[PDB]
Amino acid sequence: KLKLSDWFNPFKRPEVVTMTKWKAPVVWEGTYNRAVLDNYYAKQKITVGLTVFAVGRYIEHYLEEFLTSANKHFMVGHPVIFYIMVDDVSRMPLIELGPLRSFKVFKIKPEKRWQDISMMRMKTIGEHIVAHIQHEVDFLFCMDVDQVFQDKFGVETLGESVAQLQAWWYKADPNDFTYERRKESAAYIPFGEGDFYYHAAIFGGTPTQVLNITQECFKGILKDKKNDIEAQWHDESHLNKYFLLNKPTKILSPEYCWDYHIGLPADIKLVKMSWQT
Numbered sequence: 465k466l467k468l469s470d471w472f473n474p475f476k477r478p479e480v481v482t483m484t485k486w487k488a489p490v491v492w493e494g495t496y497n498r499a500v501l502d503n504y505y506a507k508q509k510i511t512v513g514l515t516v517f518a519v520g521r522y523i524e525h526y527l528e529e530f531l532t533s534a535n536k537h538f539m540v541g542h543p544v545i546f547y548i549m550v551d552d553v554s555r556m557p558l559i560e561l562g563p564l565r566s567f568k569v570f571k572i573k574p575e576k577r578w579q580d581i582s583m584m585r586m587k588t589i590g591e592h593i594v595a596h597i598q599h600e601v602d603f604l605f606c607m608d609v610d611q612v613f614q615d616k617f618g619v620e621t622l623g624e625s626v627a628q629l630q631a632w633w634y635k636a637d638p639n640d641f642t643y644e645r646r647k648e649s650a651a652y653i654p655f656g657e658g659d660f661y662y663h664a665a666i667f668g669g670t671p672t673q674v675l676n677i678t679q680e681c682f683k684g685i686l687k688d689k690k691n692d693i694e695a696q697w698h699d700e701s702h703l704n705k706y707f708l709l710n711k712p713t714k715i716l717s718p719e720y721c722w723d724y725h726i727g728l729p730a731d732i733k734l735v736k737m738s739w740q741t
Contacts, residue, residue, distance in 0.1 A: 466504055471497045471620065480731055484659070484715065490629070492717040493734040496620035502541055505619045511543040512622070513601035513671070515592070517585050518609040519551045519574065526610045526740060528557035533613035535565050537736070540616060545600060549588060568596075583664075583699040586682035590675050598671040605668035606678070610740050611721065617736040623714030625673040627707050630663035630700075631718040631726050631739075644701040648693050650684035651701035653708055662707045664700030666721050666737070669713070680706050 468489060474482035477492045484490060514534060518527040531546060538544060546567035550556055551574045561567065570592070575582040589606055597604055603622045633641055638658035644651035667677060684702035688695055695701035720736040 466501070471501050471504075473497075480717065484711070486711045488711060488713050488715055490715040490717060491620055491720070493719050493736075498616065498618045498620055501619040501622075505542060505622070508602070509543075510602040510619075510622075511545065511600065512539045512619075513545045513547060513597055513604040514538060515547040515549065515589055515597075515604065515606045516609045517549040517572070517583075517588070519572070519582060522609055523550055523552065523555050524557070528559060529612055529740065530607075530609050531557065531559050531561075531567075533737075534617075535559065535561050537613035537615055538617050539619060540564075542619065547592065547597070549585075581685070581698060583685075584682075586678040586685065586699060586702075590678040590682065593671045593675040593678070598675070601671060603668060604671045604674045605666060606674060608665035611665060611737050612740050613737050614722075614735045617720060621668065621714070621716055621720060623669060623712070625669035625677060625707075625710065625712045626667065626714045626716065627660070627703075627712035628663040628666040628716045628721045629718050630661045630665075631721060631723040633661035634718045636661065641704075642696060642701075643704055644695040644697070646693070646696075648691055649695045649701070650687045651695040651705045653705055657708065659708060659711065660715065662700070662704050662712070662715075663721055664697070664703045665739075666716065667703060667707075667712075676710070677703070677706055680710075 472489050473495055476494045480492055482490050482495055544565050548567055548569045549572045551572055553569055553571050556569055639655050641658055641661040643653035681702040719732055722735045722738045724738050
C-alpha cells in the first residue's frame with residue numbers, strides 16, 4: 465500500500481519543515497499529490513468524519529459557514545460524515561450537502577456549574593467515538609467551528625494522529641511556545657522540551673487515535689480540576705502535552721489553518737482553512 469514517496473515530496477518545499485525528527489510528514493501545499501491519494505483512498509472506500517461543536521452564539525455566527533465550506537472542500541470525493549454537536553438543535557442552520565457528505569446532529573448540554581470550560585468537547589468526542597464513530601469512519605477530524613475552508617482540505621491530511629501547526633507559532637522557538645509551564649498542570653511542558661505548538665482547532669487521526677488523544681486530554685483537564693488549576697490554553701494545552709508524549713504521525717501546515725490577520729507570508733501558498741470574523 466501507501467509509502468511516503470508515493471504521495472509526499474519534501475523538496476517541492478525546502479524553506480519550511482516538511483519532516484520531523486521522528487519521521488512524520490509535515491504537509492505543505494505543493495508537497496503532496498492529492499490525485500494519487502484520492503485514488504488510493506477511494507479504493508479502500510474510506511470514510512472521514514468531522515466533529516465540530518458549536519454552542520450558543522457560535523451556532524449562528526459560524527456553523528453555517530463551517531459546514532458549507534466543509535461541504536465544498538473537505539475530503540472532496542470521499543464519504544464524509546459531519547457530526548454536529550450543538551446545545552440547541554433548533555437553530556441548526558441545516559444546509560444542503562453535496563455528494564458524499566451527510567451529517568448526524570447531537571444535542572449537548574451547555575456548560576454545567578455555574579461555569580465549566582467548555583472543553584469538555586474531549587469527553588463528548590471520546591464518548592461518541594466509542595458509541596459510533598469508531599464504527600463509522602476510518603479517519604476523524606475534530607475541529608473548532610469558528611473556521612472556514614478556503615480550499616481543498618483533502619486526504620493528504622489523513623493519518624494515525626494528525627496535528628495542526630498553530631499559525632502564529634509555526635516559525636517560533638519551542639520556548640516561545642505558549643505551553644502550560646506551571647508544573648502543577650497535567651498539561652505541563654518544561655521549558656527546554658517541546659516539538660511544535662499544535663493548534664487545538666484541528667486534530668484528527670483514526671477514531672482510535674482520536675479516542676486516545678481526547679481521553680488523555682480529558683484526564684488532564686480532570687486532574688487539573690481536581691487540583692483547582694486551569695491550563696493556559698485549556699484543551700489546546702493538554703493537546704500540546706499529549707502530542708509531546710505521543711508524536712503525531714502527520715502534521716499540517718498553518719496552510720490548513722491560517723489566521724489571515726497574521727498576513728500572508730510567502731510560506732503560505734494556498735490557504736486550505738482560515739479562522740473567521
